[PDB]
């Protein structure tokens, strides 16, 4: 019964057995089958006595808070149906990820190996973080959202433990993508004598592809890294069993903007006369995330005039107001 | 016949009684299969609470019917 | 008189509490960061066990238990920070921060102008003053509305009073961040503070979070750290995660305040951080006249003010500007002993206030 | 200066359950005035009741309360009521002070009282009616409607997951050779005053004893239960609901001595609400049922609260909204009597040992 | 202590030191904030060498990307005085690599790996397996377990072209 | 803002009038916050704001600011950011709340 004690046990005349207690203290209890061996593994709760220091029994693993730095989300809501005009991105994202998890096996038959990894940079703003979940839902992954800052531990090492329970947990869950909020705490490291300060960073980073590559020929776990823009790190793009893919974001065009459009004109109304392409021409080097805001500048125009849905000339005018990082509105010069 | 009487958890559940039953016996027949102790029941049905040695006939509680068990937060 | 009855209230606060003690005493013993009943004997599993700590650990996986109604004993209590949970005896509020932050329900600074300000504050009334009063209009259209606004020109040009003065109509809090104090030179820890202002922003949603000055943190990104962009960065780019992340639009507004346009990132630009504009930057002549005319009705006066004639010797202001030369004309008539205000002492306020804006 | 404040019961020792009780129940503006106006020579509705002598007298010793709280008698002491109601209901003798009792049986007890006096008259107003649904779980072609089953409240069932008012409601409506038979019921008629029921207190299995659910359950301040009732009912409903909602925004749109003026406007205000009044009940349907709520909108009048660990420990309370400022509240804490705001209602929904709601009571939109 | 002593014991050992920045710095900017910790660890491992006790069954080897974030100690010899560095391929090295990973891998046709050191100018191992993988690419598009060499051909100029 | 210059005018015209209002004289060495680490200024200011407005009324004397009196047009880095985390937080304060006296601020340079 609880309130009982535990151990967090790191170990691994007659027999002599150490247990470490998690009030970090150091017992001796025999393993001449008084105690049973199997009672013994390393990085698991097992029970001990409190005043009689012995291991009854055995109680699941468990080491620091279970998951502390961890989001656990079983299987995004998302769809490619649900993101779409994003589907070149789509295209680089299914052969780098996606291909290697689903037909595993003829990875093992064909007698290379896996690759596990992907490294993203180049903008959002279009449903990177969209995308990301999609191909989540679509292999049947477990999200994980593991934020880089939270293993940035001033503490010493228990971030390089974090880095270990997150692989540990990603391969009881498999398939899994990890999905890495930030790359400038696994990585900003730089090349001069202040890397020195960033150790925990190279610490945390070198770990996790230490253990891909440890499971290389195995596609169980995916490791995805996003940012606006790539950061300086240590060589890891050269290397299979690394995050061997490096995929960019580019911008729209007339295709994607339009069904990016159609996307956005299901979940509002609209008066059912609106031309998506007529709007992407009119429309100079807008992103994904900017057809979304002239959706609702549009809407805007349309709570002043009094209207409930929107006509072409009210989008026209959502246009020509900001969404704060390019709006198509150029006509002056005398 | 078969009435029903909607527990606690807002469950229905059924109960095979005889108009000639009384509310005490109908009781019985809930902690049984809901474990509640009689002492413990306050059933209501149209509005009335029912009585301990009145009879479902007396009530003109017919199949089908269904009674609302409650139980009780004494203050005072 | 004032002493007997403050007696009275402690003798009678004193008896209950006494006789509750005791009680306590007995059984042997909200925000909170992680779970902490230190014993438990009360309460897969079918009792809670549930302490939350690295020196041992109790752990139970189901929560609820409407009798006994849990709590009590080693009293830090409701849900984990690890998700064993404490999970509704006496109210958890999803991780509750004890971090704090400066709140200001109300605040107080009604409409410093309403003219000469006309279309800003008029984009300010569609993004957030109407949503509150109507969710339905929104919501029909289904449009979801400005999640983040940017105010730009100098700032307390009357930029804060304006955006105040909104937030008084609707009733609703201000929960300033400021920028610049962020800053450490630890570990982690800014970017931790951000996410907890998130999970406290959820709680008490229907607020405008001010945050001061990009120029302050996350100025740059371009660098790839340097010691002070590493922190500065990380804090930043762990904060519009959260946004884009969501957080419920028509509710939660964050107003961000810059005087200088060279720090922005295109990062910051994008929607679901930044998607209004609103200028506080240079008005009109029109403009001018509107601003002088509503700072000095409050005012006394003796006769032969016109407006525009104040305006005409601005060749270029900022809001900040035009609230200084009403206040300093006021200045020279108190000096000489006044209570009105003249042509003369408006001229003379203009003349001293621009002179000293150049260089 | 000149508005007086309401006056309470005082407590005689665990005796706030039924002071709580009578709060609320004079808030229920026809019930207040037929007990009021009530004359024993009038004798009582149901004279099949064989204790019907004692339920007069209820009714009696309640209309001596209620001419007390009307007539602000700083403190009313309800004892020959108690008394009365213990000769009547003797389970409200029972001691281990008297012990603390339940509420809701109160409540229950005194409906009963008052539906054998008062007949027709006093149950039509409470009175909701189901259409209920029966279907054989195992066979979809076995189905049978009955439409007879009624009551005077609806239970509000909660659970680990209830979280809204509604939630519970929806649960309440609902239970489960022999077979499962699913049993559904939907409302085909709404009565002018709602009663609901918090489910919280409960017999704990695990020991044998009396226990009360402490989760916090939003209730609003206005319902709507178009979602409950039949198809054909609530189409009716939701078209007068529609109707009364356009009066309330053209609503929201617009020498004495000291005391002579105050009791002027206060004039001014009732003339005001009835004229208003009068404009909603110009969109009441055409055969309305006397006693049935016009659509299917309700606002809250009054809430009995409980805090404490059973049915039989703690202290009741009831949160009383005023009769012509519908922002104000009313915190009777038995005789000790203060104004409180919205908020404060609000906080009654509950979680852990607070003060939470037990009993709501909604009066329909328009009335 | 504990390392050293079992490495005694458990000799031969090679004692791998996983990136030297942070048991082996130079400090921040000469300040410091938590590189003091820093300059604890490494007065030990200076010490063990200085030492009485020798090094010669027991082997360190230190790995650290850029040789800019270790200590002046260490960079002077007598506590690190072998300093290997990772070179540029032979053109016979890559020849190796290219024959060994397609030896575990299926295959249509005898590959003629001579082109594709060619149509690399220096990649190493690791650089070589993207190259292997990126045919196979092609080969799950083509519904086969098998690659021609004309895939192989292909595979290795995209990755130059990638990268360096 | 005075300008003068220390024992000639500045000083004292300040000490003067600080002791004819009869508020306390609190007197910060501007140089000294002076203190070239990412954790210190900021708060030292927000610390001498919140203690002054507690206890008011009160001159905020800020001697000698000279060395935060720069403006950039972009930040970077710990060694530009600093000086400018400094500067910001005294605007903002400013800009962030008014009173007509509960506190003053003499600032001199």
Redesign the interface.
């Known amino acids: 019964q609880?309130?009982?004690?535990?151990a967090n046990v790191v170990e691994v005349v007659g027999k002599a057995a150490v247990v470490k207690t998690?009030?970090?203290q150091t017992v001796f209890l025999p393993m001449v089958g008084l105690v049973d061996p199997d009672k013994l593994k390393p990085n698991d709760?097992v029970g001990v006595n409190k005043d009689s220091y012995l291991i009854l029994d055995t109680l699941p693993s468990?080491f620091?808070?279970?998951?502390?730095a961890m989001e656990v989300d079983e299987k995004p809501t998302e769809t490619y149906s649900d993101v779409g005009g994003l589907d070149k991105q789509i295209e680089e994202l299914v052969?780098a990820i996606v291909?290697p998890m689903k037909?595993a096996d003829?990875?093992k038959?064909?007698?290379?190996?896996?690759?596990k990894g992907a490294l993203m940079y180049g903008?959002?703003?279009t449903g990177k973080?969209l995308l990301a979940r999609a191909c989540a839902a679509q292999t049947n992954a477990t999200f994980l959202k593991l934020?880089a800052?939270?293993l940035?531990?001033?503490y010493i090492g228990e971030g390089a433990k974090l880095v270990r329970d997150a692989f540990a947990l990603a391969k009881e869950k498999a398939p899994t993508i990890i999905f890495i909020?930030?790359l400038?705490?696994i990585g900003?490291?730089?090349?001069?004598?202040?890397?020195?300060?960033?150790?925990?960073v190279?610490?945390t980073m070198?770990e996790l592809l230490?253990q891909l590559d440890g499971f290389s020929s195995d596609d169980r776990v995916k490791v995805l890294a996003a940012?606006?823009?790539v950061?300086?790190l240590?060589?890891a793009?050269?290397?299979?069993?690394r995050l061997?893919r490096?995929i960019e974001f580019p911008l729209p065009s007339e295709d994607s903007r339009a069904q990016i459009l159609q996307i956005h004109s299901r979940?509002?109304?609209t008066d059912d006369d609106i031309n998506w392409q007529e709007l992407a021409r009119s429309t100079d080097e807008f992103?994904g995330?900017?057809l979304?805001?002239v959706?609702?500048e549009?809407?805007?125009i349309?709570?002043?005039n009094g209207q409930?849905?929107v006509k072409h000339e009210d989008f026209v005018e959502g246009i020509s107001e900001?969404?704060?990082?390019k709006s198509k509105s150029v006509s002056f010069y005398a | 016949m078969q009435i029903f009487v909607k527990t606690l958890t807002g469950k229905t559940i059924t109960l095979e009684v005889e108009p000639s039953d009384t509310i005490e016996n109908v009781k019985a027949k809930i902690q049984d299969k809901e474990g509640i102790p009689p002492d413990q029941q306050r059933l209501i049905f149209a509005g009335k609470q029912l009585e301990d040695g009145r009879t479902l006939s007396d009530y003109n509680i017919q199949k089908e019917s269904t009674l609302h068990l409650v139980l009780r937060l004494r203050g005072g | 008189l004032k002493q007997t009855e403050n007696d009275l209230k402690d003798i009678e606060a004193r008896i209950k509490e006494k006789a509750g003690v005791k009680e306590s005493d007995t059984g042997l013993a909200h925000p909170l960061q992680v779970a902490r009943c230190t014993k438990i004997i009360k309460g897969e599993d079918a009792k809670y066990v549930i302490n939350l700590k690295q020196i041992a650990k109790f752990v139970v996986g189901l929560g609820e238990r409407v009798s006994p109604t849990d709590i009590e004993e080693g009293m830090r209590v409701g849900v984990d920070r690890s998700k064993y949970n404490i999970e509704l005896p006496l109210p958890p509020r999803i991780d509750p921060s004890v971090t704090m932050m400066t709140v200001e329900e109300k605040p107080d600074v009604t409409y410093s102008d309403v003219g000469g300000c006309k279309d800003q504050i008029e984009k300010l009334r569609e993004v957030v003053e109407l949503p509150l009063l109507s969710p339905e209009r929104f919501a029909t259209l289904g449009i979801d509305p400005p999640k983040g606004i940017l105010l730009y020109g100098p700032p307390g040009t009357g930029k804060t009073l304006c955006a105040r003065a909104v937030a008084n109509r609707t009733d609703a809090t201000f929960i300033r961040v400021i920028g610049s104090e962020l800053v450490q030179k630890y570990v982690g820890e800014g970017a931790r503070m951000v996410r907890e202002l998130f999970e406290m922003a959820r709680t008490k949603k229907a607020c405008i979070i001010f945050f001061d000055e990009i120029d302050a943190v996350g100025g740059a990104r371009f660098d790839d750290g340097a010691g002070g962009d590493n922190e500065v960065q990380r804090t930043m780019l762990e904060l519009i995660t959260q946004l884009d992340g969501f957080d419920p639009r028509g509710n939660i507004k964050v107003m961000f305040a810059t005087n200088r346009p060279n720090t922005l990132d295109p990062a910051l630009l994008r929607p679901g951080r930044i998607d209004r504009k609103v200028e506080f930057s240079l008005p009109d002549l029109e403009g001018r006249a509107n601003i002088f005319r509503i700072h000095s009705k409050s005012m006394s006066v003796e006769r032969g003010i016109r407006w525009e004639l104040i305006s005409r010797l601005c060749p270029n202001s900022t809001g900040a500007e035009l609230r200084s030369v009403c206040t300093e004309a006021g200045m020279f008539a108190i000096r000489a002993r006044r209570k009105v205000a003249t042509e003369k002492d408006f001229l003379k306020a203009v003349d001293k206030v621009i002179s000293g804006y150049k260089k | 200066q000149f508005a007086q404040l309401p006056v309470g019961f005082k407590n005689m020792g665990n005796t706030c359950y039924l002071n709580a009780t009578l709060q609320a129940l004079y808030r229920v503006n026809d019930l207040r005035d037929m007990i009021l106006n009530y004359n024993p020579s009038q004798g009582v509705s149901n004279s099949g009741a064989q204790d019907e002598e004692i339920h007069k007298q209820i009714v009696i010793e309640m209309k001596r309360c209620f001419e007390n709280l009307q007539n602000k008698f700083k403190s009313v002491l309800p004892v020959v009521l108690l008394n009365t109601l213990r000769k009547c209901y003797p389970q409200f003798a029972e001691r281990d002070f008297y012990k603390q009792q339940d509420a809701e049986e109160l409540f229950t007890q005194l409906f009963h009282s008052m539906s054998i006096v008062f007949g027709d008259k006093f149950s039509e107003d409470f009175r909701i009616q189901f259409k209920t649904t029966i279907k054989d779980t195992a066979n979809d072609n076995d189905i049978t409607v009955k439409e007879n089953e009624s009551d005077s409240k609806l239970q509000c069932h909660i659970s680990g997951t209830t979280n809204f008012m509604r939630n519970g409601l929806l649960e309440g409506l609902n239970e489960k050779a022999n077979s499962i038979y699913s049993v559904e019921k939907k409302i085909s008629r709404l009565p002018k005053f709602l009663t609901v029921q918090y489910v919280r207190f409960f017999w704990k299995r695990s020991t044998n004893k009396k226990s009360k659910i402490l989760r916090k359950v939003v209730f609003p301040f206005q319902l709507d239960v178009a979602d409950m009732l039949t198809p054909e009912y609530a189409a009716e409903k939701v078209k007068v609901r529609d109707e009364l909602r356009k009066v309330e925004k053209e609503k929201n749109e617009k020498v004495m001595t000291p005391r002579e003026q105050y009791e002027t406007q206060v004039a001014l205000n009732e003339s005001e609400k009835d004229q208003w009044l009068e404009e909603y009940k110009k969109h009441f349907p055409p055969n309305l049922e006397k006693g049935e709520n016009p659509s299917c909108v309700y606002n809250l009048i009054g809430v009995i609260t409980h805090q404490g660990a059973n049915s039989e420990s703690g202290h009741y309370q009831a949160f009383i909204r005023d009769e012509l400022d519908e922002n104000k509240w009313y915190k009777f804490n038995d005789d000790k009597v203060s104004v409180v705001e919205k908020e404060k209602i609000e906080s009654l929904a509950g979680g852990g040992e607070s003060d939470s709601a037990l009993i709501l009571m909604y009066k329909g939109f328009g009335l | 202590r504990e390392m050293f002593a079992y490495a005694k014991e458990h000799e031969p050992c090679i004692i791998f030191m996983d990136e030297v920045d942070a048991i082996g710095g130079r400090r921040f900017s000469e300040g410091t904030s938590a590189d003091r910790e820093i300059q604890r660890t490494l007065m030990e491992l200076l010490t063990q060498m200085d030492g009485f006790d020798n090094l010669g069954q027991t082997k360190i080897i230190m790995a650290t990307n850029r040789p800019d974030t270790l200590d002046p100690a260490l960079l002077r010899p007598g506590r690190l005085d072998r300093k290997v560095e990772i070179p540029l391929p032979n053109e016979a090295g890559r020849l190796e690599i290219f024959k060994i990973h397609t030896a575990k891998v299926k295959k249509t046709g005898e590959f003629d790996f001579e082109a594709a050191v060619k149509m690399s100018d220096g990649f190493n191992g690791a650089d070589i397996r993207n190259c292997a993988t990126e045919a196979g690419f092609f080969a799950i598009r083509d519904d086969r377990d098998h690659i021609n060499p004309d895939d192989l051909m292909k595979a290795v100029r995209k990755v130059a072209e990638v990268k360096k | 803002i005075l300008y003068g210059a220390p024992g000639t005018g500045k000083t004292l015209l300040a000490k003067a009038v600080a002791n004819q209002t009869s508020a306390t004289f609190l007197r910060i060495v501007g140089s000294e916050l002076i203190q070239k680490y990412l954790g210190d200024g900021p708060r030292l200011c927000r610390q001498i704001f919140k203690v002054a407005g507690e206890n008011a009324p009160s001159i905020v004397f800020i001697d000698e600011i000279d060395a935060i009196g720069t403006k950039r047009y972009d930040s970077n880095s710990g060694g530009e950011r600093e000086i400018q985390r400094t500067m910001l937080e005294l605007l903002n304060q400013l800009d962030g709340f008014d009173d007509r006296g509960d506190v003053k601020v003499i600032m001199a340079t």
């Not at chain 1, 620091?64 to 502390?68: L, T």
């Not at chain 1, 038959?109 to 690759?115: L, Q, T």
């Not at chain 1, 900001?322 to 990082?325: E, K, N, Y």
């Open positions: 609880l309130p009982y004690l535990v998690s009030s970090r709760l468990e620091d808070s279970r998951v502390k052969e291909l037909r003829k990875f038959d064909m007698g290379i190996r896996a690759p903008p959002p703003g973080t934020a800052p939270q940035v531990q001033m909020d930030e400038d705490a900003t490291k730089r090349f001069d004598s202040e890397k020195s300060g960033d150790r925990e190279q610490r070198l230490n940012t606006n823009r950061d300086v240590d060589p793009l050269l290397r299979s069993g061997d490096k979940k509002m109304t992103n995330a900017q979304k805001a959706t609702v549009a809407g805007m349309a709570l002043r409930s849905s900001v969404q704060a990082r």
